[PDB]
Amino acid sequence: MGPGFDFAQAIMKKNTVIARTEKGEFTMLGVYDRVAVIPTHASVGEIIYINDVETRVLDACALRDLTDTNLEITIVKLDRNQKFRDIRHFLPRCEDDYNDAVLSVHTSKFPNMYIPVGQVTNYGFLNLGGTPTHRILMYNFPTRAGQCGGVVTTTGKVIGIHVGGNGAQGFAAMLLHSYFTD
Numbered sequence: 001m002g003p004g005f006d007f008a009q010a011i012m013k014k015n016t017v018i019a020r021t022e023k024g025e026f027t028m029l030g031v032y033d034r035v036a037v038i039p040t041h042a043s044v045g046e047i048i049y050i051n052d053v054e055t056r057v058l059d060a061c062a063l064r065d066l067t068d069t070n071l072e073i074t075i076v077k078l079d080r081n082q083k084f085r086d087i088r089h090f091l092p093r094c095e096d097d098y099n100d101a102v103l104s105v106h107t108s109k110f111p112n113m114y115i116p117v118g119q120v121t122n123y124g125f126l127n128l129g130g131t132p133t134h135r136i137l138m139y140n141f142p143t144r145a146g147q148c149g150g151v152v153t154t155t156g157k158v159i160g161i162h163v164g165g166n167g168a169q170g171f172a173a174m175l176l177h178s179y180f181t182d
């Protein structure tokens with residue numbers, strides 16, 4: 001409907017796949033080459049389904065900060081025959097607050113879904129499902145089951161992936177450029 005939805009659409013149409021694990025279907029952001037991200041609670045194993053194709057997992061790393069605290073981001077390298085468009089230049093370098101974000105989801109349950117979530121707070125610490133978690137972004141939208149893995153963007157920046165909510169607020173794990181240096 002406007003330039004925020006324009007940027008979100010451009011990321012969804014080229015840099016997302018539908019990931020299925022034994023814990024369900026997730027929006028999965030591809031970042032560069034065969035490297036993607038997914039919430040750590042998806043519990044990635046040795047085999048994952050990508051757009052309903054059986055795919056070997058070459059590597060999966062659940063990220064933690066240097067306090068050894070959960071970040072709720074898993075970086076997955078896929079044995080896929082095709083590379084993602086490199087979007088690492090759209091990743092923020094530091095922790096920040098944002099205005100006017102969009103949360104975008106694409107699954108069997110929620111295809112082509114875009115949510116204007118408004119102001120994004122650098123929330124920091126969250127007890128997420130009983131797990132202490134750092135680098136959490138918060139937005140005042142009542143997000144629902146089916147939205148985990150959703151991509152959070154502003155105009156020109158890919159800032160996080162949706163990892164939970166409390167019925168009134170939604171929570172994303174930050175994406176930082178430093179997670180994807182090769």
Ligand SMILES: CS(=O)(=O)N1CCC(O)CC1
Pocket residue numbers: 041128129130131163164
């Ligand atoms: C899905 S959840 O309940 O928000 N939660 C995610 C983090 C994990 O460590 C515990 C479970």
